[PDB]
Amino acid sequence: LHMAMSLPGMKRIGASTKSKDRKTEVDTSHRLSIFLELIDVHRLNGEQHEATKVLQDAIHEFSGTSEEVRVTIANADLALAQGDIERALSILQNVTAEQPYFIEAREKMADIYLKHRKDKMLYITCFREIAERMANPRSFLLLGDAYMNILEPEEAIVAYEQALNQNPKDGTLASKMGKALIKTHNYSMAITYYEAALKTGQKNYLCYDLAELLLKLKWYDKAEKVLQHALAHEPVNELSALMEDGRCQVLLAKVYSKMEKLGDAITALQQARELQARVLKRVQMEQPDAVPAQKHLAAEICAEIAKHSVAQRDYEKAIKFYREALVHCETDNKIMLELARLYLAQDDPDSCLRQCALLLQSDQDNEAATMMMADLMFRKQDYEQAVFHLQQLLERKPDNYMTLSRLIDLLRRCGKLEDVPRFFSMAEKRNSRAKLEPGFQYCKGLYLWYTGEPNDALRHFNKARKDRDWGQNALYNMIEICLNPDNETVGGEVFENLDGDLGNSTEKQESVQLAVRTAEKLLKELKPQTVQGHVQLRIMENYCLMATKQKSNVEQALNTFTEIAASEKEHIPALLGMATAYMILKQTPRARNQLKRIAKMNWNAIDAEEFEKSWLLLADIYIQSAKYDMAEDLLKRCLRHNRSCCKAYEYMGYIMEKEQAYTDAALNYEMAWKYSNRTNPAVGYKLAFNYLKAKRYVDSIDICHQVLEAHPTYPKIRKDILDKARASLR
Amino acid sequence: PSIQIKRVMTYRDLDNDLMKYSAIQTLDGEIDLKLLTKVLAPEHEVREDDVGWDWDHLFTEVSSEVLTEWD
Amino acid sequence: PVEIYSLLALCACASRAFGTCSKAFIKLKSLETLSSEQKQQYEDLALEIFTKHTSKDNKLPTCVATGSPITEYQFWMCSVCKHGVLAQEISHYSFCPLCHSPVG
Ligand SMILES: [Zn+2]
């Protein structure tokens, strides 16, 4: 700045520097900027006296000039530096309307009143004086902004209307009107104002505003009519008209999608794509500013076209349009994710892996990309390295919870839940309140449920039922737990025939009724957002009807499941529900045929639990029909796809018992006993019996002690097993 | 205690809270205000009993709870 | 500010004060320390609320006990916190609600 001082003309501008070079003359604003920068730098340097001296120099030099007011503002700033509020107030009060930068000085007046003295009335009157002394739209708009800052929306709207009356059209100002009216939530008068504007000599920008407003608050038909009326214009070659038509076409396509007309939406999106193609051709040379925005808009248009094609189940054109959108914009993570998800949907692991690798190269964490890659390589049955990827992501970002949830699911299918708690450790280490995080609570509930303590898992889930994201999944899990806590085969009768008298307790029926009531209460809490959500809600309402154990309700659920299956082809949950309905109502051969059909389809990463229930029920049917071989095959299949399915292990133990495979039966029963958290005394009875038969007396005694500690009243175990094992020790 | 008893108790505990706080949780019963209720605090947290607050005991209490919270 | 105005909006909604409710969401949306997703959530909730109902609505010292202004000139005053409590609610408290010093 001192070198700048030595620059020609930087000493007393107007000192008769007869250089005859009035083309490089130091502009007054530039010189004032130099001096103010020097003053600020010296103030940062602590040279308060030197800064004051330079300020006095500027005041002395620039008196009578246009920029002089700014100097006084800086002087007022110095007062704010010194804390002398009254001095700054007086200095800015000296500023009059005739001088330039008056609006800045009076705005600083208003800011000083607002921040320090908090005089709302004075804050209002400052802008009122601004408006009165200079009756221009700028002053009125500033007054409206001031009112909106003091939260007086009605007077703000009045000031805005005065602004838009001072200049009757003013162009952009009119649009501001609507936004003001849309910000104060005066929607009805906003709609009336848009209609009044549109009625006479206004361009389709207000048409776009009215269409957007009508879409926002659900009047689809009026928005569609307005959009069609505005789009009836001739295809003008003007670039601005092209952009306006493109955005109107996109909004109309969204309107059509909202009101369920897919073909019309696709046609509108195609027209928008053509318009955006013309725009991209023109703008690259006609407007350097809009090139990235137009490219992104074209990418969004292509993405929407592909998404609606997916909704129409045309996957090839969807892939093509995602490729086009990625060509338009290569940095769109959402489009990359959608392309990977479709590649997974088309059962093409290679392309999905390529997209996941590209996305992970783009961003290392990218939780969802980790999800897709881990699921893909889990389909490869490379469990250890997928678990490694999830564990690395979690150890890098312990705050992550959805990754933690998928890790819990993968570990459960891997039968390695023992490593689950340690993650919680550093999950607790990052934040002392992490126990209050909904995601951590949901993951903890999932782990507890998978280990076989439904009540405490449900309690943990409760704290996450109110989350914006985790709420829906938490409610789903609570419904599943309440409807069937024992995790037994719904409709299966391999062990129900073995539970003829144990199920006669009325307390069981009372608990079932209470759980059904609680599940029905929880159903009202759910708020489905898409058609899939409504389908899921209907499916679980049908499950609740099944749990009520009312024959009319069961048959109604059967009819509803049949209707849903007819509606959506190859829908696995619907098939499982209707098959269970046939099973319970003793339509056993129909259930057998249905499960034969179900087993033909291959397992997927979304309906795994439905697949496991289906396979378990089919194994039940086979065991009932004495088809041990294929039941064993299906049970091995289920255990291959999940390594901690207690019911599958119990079935295997029963099968090995039927063949007197006492060692294998004992191993399977032990595994089931361990994974059930020893809450089923009958399994312990079978396991102790199998140890006793296999001549392993001490292990039988241990299991008998465990069962009796779990249930001191459980009969037929002291004598039939424990006493006989004790007598055979020597 | 009976397992069925534990299940019944859990179901009643879950049923309690929803109707306990539906009075202010939602508007008119159809609009859910979970977005705005997040800044509220538990009932017992905003209960104060009329007890003298001497400097020493209050300081010791707040110091102990801060040390427990701080890590 | 976010906690203050969220609580104010909640009170307005629970007390049928929709004018103050609108005045609350205006500042809540206009707050500069909010994420874009949070702004969208607030805007959507306000849209639902104000489609359901109309947005239009229907210093003195402050009493510590109930926040109402102390209209009366004679009023119980604390010996420490220097903030008054109304004569109709002094007898209820054995210590000053603001500072928990003994009443007197
Ligand atoms: Zn006091």
Query: Rounded to whole angstroms, how far apart are CA atoms A462 and A442?
Result: 8
**Chain A residues with beta carbon closer than 8 angstroms to that of B13:** 459
**Chain C residues with beta carbon closer than 8 angstroms to that of B39:** 2-3, 6-7, 10
Q: Residue for token digits 């079978």?
A: A686
Is there a contact between A644 and A418 (Cβ–Cβ < 8 Å)?
no
**Chain B residues with beta carbon closer than 8 angstroms to that of C49:** 27, 31
Q: Residue C27 to residues A113, A152, B34, C4: CA-CA distances in angstroms?
A: 20, 11, 19, 10
Q: At what angle do helices A220-231 and A239-258 cross, to 10 degrees?
A: 150
Length of chain B: 71
Query: Rounded to whole angstroms, how far apart are CA atoms A656 and A672?
Result: 14
Listed by number, the residues of chain A in 453-482 with a beta carbon closer than 8 Å to a beta carbon of chain B are: 455, 458-459, 462, 466, 468, 478, 482
Is there a contact between A328 and A344 (Cβ–Cβ < 8 Å)?
no
Q: Residue A627 to residues A503, A641, C97: CA-CA distances in angstroms?
A: 27, 22, 78
Query: Rounded to whole angstroms, how far apart are CA atoms A342 and A301?
Result: 18
Q: Which two tokens stand for residue A227?
A: 């959009």
Q: A630: distance to nearest CA of chain C, Å?
A: 52
Q: Residue for token digits 């678990």?
A: A387
**Chain A residues with beta carbon closer than 8 angstroms to that of C51:** 187, 217-218
Q: Which two tokens stand for residue A263?
A: 């073909």
Q: Is A716 helix (H, G, I), strand (E, B) or coil?
A: coil
Smallest CA–CA distance from C18 into chain B, residue: B27
Q: Residue for token digits 């009976």?
A: B2
A148, A187, A468: residue with CB nearest C50: A187
Residue ranges of the alpha helices (H) in A330-468? 333-345, 349-362, 367-379, 383-396, 402-414, 420-430, 438-451, 454-462
Query: Resolution reached, in Å?
Result: 3.7
Judged by a CB distance cut-off of 8 A, whether residue A187 touches chain C is yes
Pairing of strands C84-85, B26-27: unpaired
Query: Rounded to whole angstroms, how far apart are CA atoms A35 and A54?
Result: 7
Q: Which residues pair with C85 in a beta bridge?
A: C76
Q: Which two tokens stand for residue A432?
A: 């002392």
Q: Residue for token digits 């493109």?
A: A246
Q: Which two tokens stand for residue A613?
A: 């229930």
Q: Which amino acid is at C65?
A: A
Rounded to 5°, the CA angle B8-B14-B18 comes to 140
Is there a contact between A164 and A170 (Cβ–Cβ < 8 Å)?
yes
Q: Write out the residues of chain C at the interface with chain A, using a CB-CB cutoff of 8 A.
A: 22-23, 25-27, 29-30, 41, 46-47, 50-51, 55-56
B3, B8, B34: residue with CB nearest A466: B34
Handedness of CA B26, B31, B32, B38 (dihedral sign): negative
Pairing of strands C84-85, C76-77: antiparallel
Least Cα distance to C26 among A124, A118, A144 occurs for A144
Residues with CB under 5 Å of ion ligand 1 are: C 78, 81, 96, 98-99
Give which of C2, C43, C45 to mutate to test B binding, by max B Cβ within 10 Å.
C45
Query: Rounded to whole angstroms, how far apart are CA atoms A179 and A163?
Result: 14
Q: Which two tokens stand for residue A270?
A: 């195609």
B31, B38, B40: residue with CB nearest C49: B31
Query: Rounded to whole angstroms, how far apart are CA atoms A174 and A194?
Result: 10
**Chain C residues with beta carbon closer than 8 angstroms to that of A151:** 23, 26-27
Judged by a CB distance cut-off of 8 A, whether residue A153 touches chain C is yes
B51 DSSP 8-state letter: -
- Which distant-in-sequence residues (6+ apart) come within 8 Å of A320 by Cβ? A306
Judged by a CB distance cut-off of 8 A, whether residue B53 touches chain C is yes
Which chains have 3+ CB pairs within 8 A of C?
A, B
Which chains have 3+ CB pairs within 8 A of B?
A, C
Say whether C26 and A148 touch across the interface (CB within 8 A). Answer: yes
Q: At what angle do helices A102-112 and A137-149 cross, to 10 degrees?
A: 10
Smallest CA–CA distance from B13 into chain A, residue: A459
Pairing of strands C84-85, B31-32: unpaired
Least Cα distance to A689 among A650, A722, A661, A640 occurs for A722
Rounded to 5°, the CA angle A105-A110-A115 comes to 125
C84 DSSP 8-state letter: E
Q: Residue A35 to residues A9, A39, A43: CA-CA distances in angstroms?
A: 13, 6, 12
Say whether B8 and A521 touch across the interface (CB within 8 A). Answer: no
Say whether A458 and B10 touch across the interface (CB within 8 A). Answer: yes
Distance C89 CA to ligand 1 centre (A): 14
Torsion of CA A84, A87, A88, A93, to 10 degrees: 160
Judged by a CB distance cut-off of 8 A, whether residue B8 touches chain A is yes
Distance A484 CA to ligand 1 centre (A): 57
* First and final C-alpha spacing in chain C: 36
Rounded to 5°, the CA angle A472-B41-A478 comes to 25
